[PDB]
């Protein structure tokens, strides 16, 4: 229901070791998190998690 959106333009950096491979209902490739993770958005000036 709730869709997390990107705060600003940049690169998404996260550690792929804690996330396990999956297949979305919509058929796209994806990653499932069973634990808390912190993604970083390398933007021009600031970051976001």
């Amino acid at each position: 229901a709730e869709h997390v959106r990107a705060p600003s333009n940049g690169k998404i950096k996260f550690n792929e070791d804690l996330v396990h491979p999956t297949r979305t209902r919509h058929g796209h490739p994806a990653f499932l998190c069973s634990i808390d993770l912190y993604v970083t958005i390398e933007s021009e000036d600031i970051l976001h998690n």
Binding site: H3, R5, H26, G27
Partner: protein
């Protein structure tokens, strides 16, 4: 009577970013429809994605409508009529100015 509020054609304002959301939504819909013909996805998935990639897009627009009005054009006649509770509802306003 002294203020004489009125609603116009140009007075109806759309969220700055609509051409981007609709464009990326239709681009994703095209990519899906291509792949469907190649066998990478099945119809149920196509059916589902279509409904969702559209519902999410629309809601971003509706939720974003109020901030735009309060931040950019505070005294917009449609915003005055909606926020005051006189006439209209958020749902009605969305249909007029969003999607």
């Amino acid at each position: 009577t002294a203020t004489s509020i009125s609603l116009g054609i140009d007075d109806l304002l759309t969220i700055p970013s609509k051409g981007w959301l609709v464009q990326d939504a239709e681009q994703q819909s095209l990519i899906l429809e291509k792949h469907h013909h190649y066998g990478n996805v099945h119809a149920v998935e196509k059916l589902r994605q279509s409904i969702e990639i559209w519902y999410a897009t629309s809601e971003y627009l509706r939720q974003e409508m109020n901030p735009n009005f309060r931040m950019t054009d505070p005294f917009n006649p449609v915003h005055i009529m909606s926020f005051s509770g006189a006439r209209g509802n958020a749902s009605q306003v969305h249909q007029l100015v969003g999607m």
